[PDB]
């Protein structure tokens, strides 16, 4: 389908972090109920050929065109042992489905009202900040994303269940073609989900960081205010690394 020129260009447009002298993995929670974050949310339910990010993910999974992996509590394993079986996901999260009319591009039959495109209201983003050795610049590479269904908790209270991990390389080709609008004040669909992620237009709070104890911010920040404070502290650490890289604004000479 793709031409040779396009393949070469795409392989030239991939970020490489192989020999980076510095690295840092950060797990952020992106809330779709915020402006500049609802780009992944609109439309909550499909409008003709318009779907939000989770609708596209669910559609690709309905075919055999997307491999997603189970959300484990502590680590990410994108191996065949953890590959998600679609059949034992709808029953697990109670999504109504029927036998399909054709096994091609359709594993089952799911109505739009069944698909939690509007209930999925948050995402997990696994960023990797890296320092390029040849260029001496700091960049961010997205490793994986994970939708969070916000369905009500049984017996009361709200329960947020992460669904599964989507390796970003697996979904990148599909989300580079669907144009979206990046604002409510300008409805032109002049961008894509891939541009939204590559430009780091999402705003999330750091919920985890790759450390030597495998600790998550929740394990030592009881109150939400403390969690926000810790996220601010870690963001300050990253920005301070970037600032300390360079000395062109030091006037103590």
């Amino acid at each position: 389908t793709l031409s040779n020129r396009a393949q070469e260009f795409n392989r030239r447009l991939t970020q490489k972090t192989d020999n980076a002298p510095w690295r840092r993995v950060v797990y952020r929670r992106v809330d779709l109920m915020e402006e500049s974050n609802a780009v992944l949310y609109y439309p909550p339910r499909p409008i003709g050929d318009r779907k939000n990010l989770f609708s596209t993910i669910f559609g690709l999974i309905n075919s055999n065109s997307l491999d997603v992996y189970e959300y484990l509590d502590g680590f990410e394993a994108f191996t065949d042992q953890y590959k998600i079986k679609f059949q034992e996901f709808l029953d697990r999260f109670g999504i109504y489905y029927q036998p399909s009319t054709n096994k091609n591009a359709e594993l089952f039959k799911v109505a739009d009202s069944d698909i939690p495109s509007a209930e999925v209201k948050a995402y997990y983003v696994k960023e990797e900040w890296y320092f390029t050795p040849t260029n001496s610049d700091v960049d961010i590479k997205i490793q994986a994303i994970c939708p969070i269904m916000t369905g009500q908790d049984e017996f009361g209270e709200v329960r947020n269940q992460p669904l599964f991990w989507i390796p970003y390389e697996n979904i990148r080709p599909y989300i580079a073609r669907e144009r979206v609008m990046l604002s409510s004040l300008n409805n032109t669909r002049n961008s894509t989900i891939d541009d939204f992620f590559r430009l780091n237009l999402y705003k999330g709070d750091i919920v985890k960081t790759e450390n030597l104890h495998n600790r998550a911010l929740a394990e030592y920040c009881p109150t939400p205010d403390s969690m926000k404070m810790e996220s601010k502290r870690i963001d300050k650490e990253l920005q301070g690394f970037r600032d300390g890289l360079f000395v062109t604004q030091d006037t103590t000479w």
Binding site: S3, N4, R5, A6, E8, F9, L13, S36, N135, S136, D137, D139, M181, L182, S183, S184, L185, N186, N187, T188, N190, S191, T192, D194, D195, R198, L199, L201
Partner: protein, 445 residues
Amino acid sequence: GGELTGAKLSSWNEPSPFGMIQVPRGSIVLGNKEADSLWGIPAESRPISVDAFWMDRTEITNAQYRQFVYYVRDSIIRERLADPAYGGNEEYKITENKFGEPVTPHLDWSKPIPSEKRATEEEIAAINSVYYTNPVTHDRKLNPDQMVYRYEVYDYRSAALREHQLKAAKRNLNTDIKVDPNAVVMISKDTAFVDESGNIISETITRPLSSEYDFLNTYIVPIYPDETCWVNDFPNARTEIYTRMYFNHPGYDDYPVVGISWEQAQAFCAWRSEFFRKGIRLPEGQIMDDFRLPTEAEWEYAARMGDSNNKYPWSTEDLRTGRGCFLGNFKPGEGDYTADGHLIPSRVSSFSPNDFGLYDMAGNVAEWTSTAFSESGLKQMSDINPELEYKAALTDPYILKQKVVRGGSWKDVARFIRSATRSHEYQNVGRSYIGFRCVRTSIAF
């Protein structure tokens, strides 16, 4: 032997191009750090560094492009004169030297073309073969379908890629990895030719990498300006006068050329490089760089005078001088193009230049760059000499053939004449508000 002296090379001579100013190496933060918040467009900024280069003082004018058009016309006429089909005069195509040794056939530009009044029937037919007369209006103009320019470009960067080494053993310096004998590298190139029927056949060839010819791209491009743009760009307007006179009136000679597509601009740059090389004497070993369209990073650096505090190609943050005179030719008022004195483009150098010495980097006509357009293109380019180069395949989707445009034009609002604003256009599309200027890498120490 002895001590370690140096094997100095032979001193070269650098010819400073005419009509060009020098832009020094430096750094700038491309983009703006604040957004409008009413355009709904997030602000993107990226610091980059560029090397020194020569940049055209003004945008290419109608006469400057007419020189290219006239060269193409004269070359085609000479090719037809020394042709049995039209004429047959061998004196217009040299095939042997003064000693009889076979050589590369080429045109004899010394002998003048026959004058129409003094030309014979065959010469007159050859001369008229490149013209076209309207049967209704009886107007004789150069045939756009005959004004085609042929040129080749060698892809030095692709040939230098490690994955494209002609020897398989040299494509991987990791000794742990053994070079597969079956491994094949697929390369794409462009070729074009004129068939016996006279139609131009252009194609993208994909084949295994085997030789240096895999890195040569050949183009035959119709280069006559698209004058109908004036009518097509503005429905329900009386703009056919410009479609008839803008490129053909002597009073518009110094106005920027419009209706030129990205491919035609590249062809003009190649012709300019060849023309410049033909008329200079270069010592053995001397190597020069060719004229080219600027990169969007280079253009933005030159427009803002290498200063990150400038939004426009002038120091002040306003759009008028202290006396109320506008600093460029754009659309300042609602339905009010003429507030600055000009409705359509104006004569180049009608306003004050840059600190670098460049005119009309804001307004007049927006200018082609060599960068392929991408929404996240600023993040995907390099830190040094940033460039996003794409040679689209012919059978590629149309969406992949967009190139970045910079500067703003006579029909743009003040937002789009800001040096950091990016527009785009398809590579085969010409507009009545897009021109271009050329750049040349300068070897300076």
